[PDB]
Design a protein around this ligand. Structure first.
Ligand SMILES: N=C(N)c1ccc(O[C@H]2CO[C@H]3[C@@H]2OC[C@H]3Oc2ccc(C(=N)N)cc2)cc1
Ligand SMILES: [Ca+2]
Length: 223
Protein backbone atom coordinates (compact mmCIF):
# COMPACT_ATOMS: atom_id res chain seq x y z
CA UNK A 1 0.00 0.00 0.00
CA UNK A 2 1.45 3.36 -1.09
CA UNK A 3 0.32 6.54 0.71
CA UNK A 4 -1.67 4.65 3.31
CA UNK A 5 -1.41 4.17 7.05
CA UNK A 6 -0.78 1.48 9.68
CA UNK A 7 -4.16 -0.16 10.19
CA UNK A 8 -3.67 -1.22 13.79
CA UNK A 9 -3.37 -4.82 14.95
CA UNK A 10 -6.35 -6.98 13.97
CA UNK A 11 -8.53 -4.05 12.92
CA UNK A 12 -9.08 -5.79 9.55
CA UNK A 13 -9.96 -9.20 10.87
CA UNK A 14 -10.86 -10.74 7.48
CA UNK A 15 -7.43 -9.96 6.04
CA UNK A 16 -5.26 -13.03 5.55
CA UNK A 17 -1.69 -13.53 4.43
CA UNK A 18 -0.89 -16.29 1.93
CA UNK A 19 2.43 -17.89 2.88
CA UNK A 20 4.70 -20.36 1.07
CA UNK A 21 7.69 -19.95 3.38
CA UNK A 22 7.12 -16.23 2.98
CA UNK A 23 4.27 -13.77 2.48
CA UNK A 24 3.38 -13.56 -1.23
CA UNK A 25 -0.28 -12.39 -1.41
CA UNK A 26 -3.30 -11.22 0.58
CA UNK A 27 -6.78 -12.78 0.66
CA UNK A 28 -10.14 -12.34 2.45
CA UNK A 29 -11.90 -14.71 4.83
CA UNK A 30 -15.45 -15.11 3.59
CA UNK A 31 -16.46 -17.84 5.98
CA UNK A 32 -14.75 -20.13 8.49
CA UNK A 33 -13.66 -22.51 5.75
CA UNK A 34 -12.90 -20.36 2.70
CA UNK A 35 -10.73 -17.49 1.44
CA UNK A 36 -11.10 -15.41 -1.69
CA UNK A 37 -7.90 -14.19 -3.38
CA UNK A 38 -6.72 -13.27 -7.00
CA UNK A 39 -6.09 -16.00 -9.56
CA UNK A 40 -2.70 -14.47 -10.25
CA UNK A 41 -1.68 -15.44 -6.66
CA UNK A 42 -2.13 -19.11 -7.51
CA UNK A 43 0.60 -21.43 -6.33
CA UNK A 44 0.76 -24.88 -4.79
CA UNK A 45 1.62 -25.38 -1.11
CA UNK A 46 -0.24 -22.42 0.35
CA UNK A 47 -0.56 -21.82 4.10
CA UNK A 48 -3.19 -19.29 5.10
CA UNK A 49 -2.20 -17.05 7.96
CA UNK A 50 -5.08 -15.47 9.87
CA UNK A 51 -5.05 -13.00 12.76
CA UNK A 52 -1.82 -11.46 11.52
CA UNK A 53 -0.53 -7.99 12.17
CA UNK A 54 3.29 -8.19 12.09
CA UNK A 55 3.92 -11.04 9.63
CA UNK A 56 7.50 -11.50 10.92
CA UNK A 57 6.64 -11.80 14.63
CA UNK A 58 4.41 -14.25 16.55
CA UNK A 59 2.18 -11.83 18.51
CA UNK A 60 -0.28 -14.39 19.84
CA UNK A 61 -3.43 -14.18 17.79
CA UNK A 62 -2.33 -16.02 14.65
CA UNK A 63 -3.93 -19.05 13.08
CA UNK A 64 -1.80 -20.92 10.54
CA UNK A 65 -3.90 -23.29 8.41
CA UNK A 66 -2.89 -25.14 5.29
CA UNK A 67 -4.98 -24.98 2.14
CA UNK A 68 -6.71 -28.20 1.23
CA UNK A 69 -7.78 -26.97 -2.22
CA UNK A 70 -7.38 -24.06 -4.61
CA UNK A 71 -9.90 -23.20 -7.29
CA UNK A 72 -8.89 -20.67 -9.95
CA UNK A 73 -11.85 -19.19 -11.81
CA UNK A 74 -12.76 -21.47 -14.73
CA UNK A 75 -12.30 -18.56 -17.21
CA UNK A 76 -9.29 -16.80 -15.64
CA UNK A 77 -7.14 -15.28 -18.40
CA UNK A 78 -3.56 -14.60 -17.34
CA UNK A 79 -2.89 -12.46 -20.43
CA UNK A 80 -5.49 -9.89 -19.60
CA UNK A 81 -6.19 -10.65 -15.87
CA UNK A 82 -9.88 -11.07 -16.68
CA UNK A 83 -11.69 -13.13 -14.02
CA UNK A 84 -8.81 -12.66 -11.54
CA UNK A 85 -10.32 -14.57 -8.66
CA UNK A 86 -9.54 -17.78 -6.83
CA UNK A 87 -11.05 -19.68 -3.88
CA UNK A 88 -8.93 -21.42 -1.24
CA UNK A 89 -10.43 -24.04 1.09
CA UNK A 90 -8.94 -24.31 4.57
CA UNK A 91 -7.86 -27.79 5.67
CA UNK A 92 -9.53 -27.10 9.04
CA UNK A 93 -12.09 -24.41 9.80
CA UNK A 94 -10.76 -21.17 11.23
CA UNK A 95 -11.70 -20.46 14.82
CA UNK A 96 -13.65 -17.22 14.65
CA UNK A 97 -13.12 -14.48 17.24
CA UNK A 98 -12.71 -10.70 17.48
CA UNK A 99 -9.42 -10.86 15.57
CA UNK A 100 -10.40 -13.49 12.99
CA UNK A 101 -13.71 -12.74 11.28
CA UNK A 102 -15.28 -13.17 7.88
CA UNK A 103 -16.28 -10.45 5.44
CA UNK A 104 -19.67 -10.35 3.72
CA UNK A 105 -20.07 -10.86 -0.03
CA UNK A 106 -22.06 -8.13 -1.80
CA UNK A 107 -25.52 -8.54 -3.38
CA UNK A 108 -25.21 -5.53 -5.69
CA UNK A 109 -22.40 -3.75 -7.49
CA UNK A 110 -21.05 -0.59 -5.91
CA UNK A 111 -21.53 2.86 -7.41
CA UNK A 112 -18.81 5.25 -8.45
CA UNK A 113 -17.59 7.35 -5.52
CA UNK A 114 -18.26 4.81 -2.79
CA UNK A 115 -15.44 4.77 -0.26
CA UNK A 116 -13.59 1.53 0.34
CA UNK A 117 -10.85 0.18 2.58
CA UNK A 118 -7.97 -1.59 0.86
CA UNK A 119 -5.30 -3.36 2.87
CA UNK A 120 -2.13 -5.39 2.64
CA UNK A 121 1.57 -5.96 3.24
CA UNK A 122 2.57 -4.86 -0.28
CA UNK A 123 5.22 -2.40 -1.45
CA UNK A 124 4.84 1.05 0.17
CA UNK A 125 6.90 2.97 -2.42
CA UNK A 126 5.75 4.31 -5.80
CA UNK A 127 9.40 4.47 -6.88
CA UNK A 128 11.55 1.61 -5.67
CA UNK A 129 10.80 -1.03 -3.07
CA UNK A 130 9.94 -1.24 0.60
CA UNK A 131 7.90 -3.96 2.24
CA UNK A 132 6.32 -3.36 5.64
CA UNK A 133 5.93 -5.93 8.41
CA UNK A 134 2.60 -4.69 9.78
CA UNK A 135 -0.64 -4.36 7.83
CA UNK A 136 -1.23 -1.10 5.94
CA UNK A 137 -4.58 0.45 5.08
CA UNK A 138 -5.87 2.88 2.47
CA UNK A 139 -9.25 4.59 2.04
CA UNK A 140 -9.99 4.96 -1.66
CA UNK A 141 -13.15 5.74 -3.62
CA UNK A 142 -14.45 3.74 -6.55
CA UNK A 143 -13.75 5.69 -9.73
CA UNK A 144 -16.15 6.12 -12.63
CA UNK A 145 -16.00 3.36 -15.20
CA UNK A 146 -15.33 6.01 -17.84
CA UNK A 147 -12.26 7.33 -15.97
CA UNK A 148 -11.08 3.76 -15.39
CA UNK A 149 -11.43 2.77 -19.06
CA UNK A 150 -9.83 6.03 -20.25
CA UNK A 151 -6.84 5.40 -17.97
CA UNK A 152 -6.41 1.91 -19.51
CA UNK A 153 -8.07 1.92 -22.94
CA UNK A 154 -8.82 -1.52 -24.40
CA UNK A 155 -7.83 -3.38 -21.24
CA UNK A 156 -10.65 -2.98 -18.71
CA UNK A 157 -13.46 -5.50 -18.80
CA UNK A 158 -16.79 -5.35 -17.07
CA UNK A 159 -15.30 -7.78 -14.49
CA UNK A 160 -12.90 -5.04 -13.37
CA UNK A 161 -13.12 -1.69 -11.69
CA UNK A 162 -10.84 1.16 -10.76
CA UNK A 163 -10.44 2.67 -7.33
CA UNK A 164 -8.07 5.23 -5.99
CA UNK A 165 -6.77 8.60 -7.01
CA UNK A 166 -6.03 9.85 -10.55
CA UNK A 167 -3.55 12.37 -9.13
CA UNK A 168 -1.43 9.47 -7.86
CA UNK A 169 0.30 9.09 -4.49
CA UNK A 170 -2.16 6.63 -2.97
CA UNK A 171 -2.67 3.07 -4.25
CA UNK A 172 -2.31 -0.61 -3.63
CA UNK A 173 0.83 -2.30 -5.01
CA UNK A 174 2.79 -5.51 -5.52
CA UNK A 175 2.37 -7.82 -2.53
CA UNK A 176 -1.10 -6.47 -1.82
CA UNK A 177 -2.29 -8.76 -4.62
CA UNK A 178 -5.33 -10.87 -3.82
CA UNK A 179 -6.29 -8.74 -0.81
CA UNK A 180 -9.55 -7.00 -0.04
CA UNK A 181 -11.33 -3.92 -1.26
CA UNK A 182 -14.17 -3.58 1.25
CA UNK A 183 -16.93 -1.05 0.67
CA UNK A 184 -19.96 -0.45 2.90
CA UNK A 185 -19.23 -3.74 4.75
CA UNK A 186 -18.97 -5.89 1.65
CA UNK A 187 -16.08 -7.42 -0.29
CA UNK A 188 -16.46 -5.55 -3.61
CA UNK A 189 -12.91 -5.92 -4.91
CA UNK A 190 -9.73 -7.95 -4.98
CA UNK A 191 -6.30 -6.34 -5.57
CA UNK A 192 -5.60 -7.33 -9.17
CA UNK A 193 -3.44 -5.08 -11.36
CA UNK A 194 -2.33 -1.57 -12.37
CA UNK A 195 0.50 0.18 -14.19
CA UNK A 196 3.20 0.66 -11.53
CA UNK A 197 1.78 1.98 -8.25
CA UNK A 198 0.40 5.35 -7.22
CA UNK A 199 1.29 6.77 -10.64
CA UNK A 200 -0.71 9.66 -12.11
CA UNK A 201 -3.80 8.65 -14.13
CA UNK A 202 -3.03 4.96 -13.48
CA UNK A 203 -5.32 3.94 -10.60
CA UNK A 204 -5.60 0.47 -9.16
CA UNK A 205 -7.60 -2.15 -11.05
CA UNK A 206 -9.65 -4.58 -8.98
CA UNK A 207 -11.62 -7.75 -9.66
CA UNK A 208 -15.31 -6.90 -9.56
CA UNK A 209 -16.56 -9.37 -6.96
CA UNK A 210 -20.26 -8.61 -7.41
CA UNK A 211 -20.06 -10.36 -10.80
CA UNK A 212 -18.82 -13.57 -9.13
CA UNK A 213 -21.04 -14.02 -6.09
CA UNK A 214 -23.13 -16.83 -7.60
CA UNK A 215 -20.01 -18.66 -8.77
CA UNK A 216 -18.50 -18.21 -5.32
CA UNK A 217 -21.54 -19.47 -3.52
CA UNK A 218 -22.19 -22.42 -5.88
CA UNK A 219 -18.56 -23.42 -5.84
CA UNK A 220 -18.16 -23.37 -2.07
CA UNK A 221 -21.43 -25.24 -1.56
CA UNK A 222 -20.25 -27.99 -3.89
CA UNK A 223 -16.76 -28.29 -2.38
N1 LIG B 1 3.87 -14.79 -10.21
C1 LIG B 1 4.20 -14.15 -11.38
N2 LIG B 1 5.24 -14.57 -12.08
C2 LIG B 1 3.44 -12.91 -11.68
C3 LIG B 1 2.00 -12.87 -11.44
C4 LIG B 1 1.31 -11.64 -11.73
C5 LIG B 1 2.06 -10.50 -12.27
O1 LIG B 1 1.52 -9.27 -12.59
C6 LIG B 1 0.11 -9.00 -12.28
C7 LIG B 1 -0.17 -7.71 -13.09
O2 LIG B 1 0.01 -6.60 -12.17
C8 LIG B 1 -0.17 -7.10 -10.79
C9 LIG B 1 -0.16 -8.62 -10.78
O3 LIG B 1 0.93 -8.98 -9.82
C10 LIG B 1 1.97 -7.93 -9.85
C11 LIG B 1 1.12 -6.68 -10.02
O4 LIG B 1 0.68 -6.30 -8.67
C12 LIG B 1 0.09 -5.03 -8.65
C13 LIG B 1 -0.81 -4.77 -7.58
C14 LIG B 1 -1.41 -3.48 -7.50
C15 LIG B 1 -1.15 -2.47 -8.50
C16 LIG B 1 -1.79 -1.14 -8.42
N3 LIG B 1 -2.84 -0.96 -7.65
N4 LIG B 1 -1.04 -0.08 -8.90
C17 LIG B 1 -0.24 -2.73 -9.59
C18 LIG B 1 0.33 -4.03 -9.69
C19 LIG B 1 3.46 -10.57 -12.48
C20 LIG B 1 4.14 -11.76 -12.17
CA1 LIG C 1 2.44 -12.34 13.34
Amino acid sequence: IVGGYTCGANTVPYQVSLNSGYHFCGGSLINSQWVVSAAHCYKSGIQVRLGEDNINVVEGNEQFISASKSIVHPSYNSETYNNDIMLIKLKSAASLNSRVASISLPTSCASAGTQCLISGWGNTKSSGTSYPDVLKCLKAPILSDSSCKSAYPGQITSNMFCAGYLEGGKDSCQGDSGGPVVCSGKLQGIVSWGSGCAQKNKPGVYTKVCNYVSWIKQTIASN
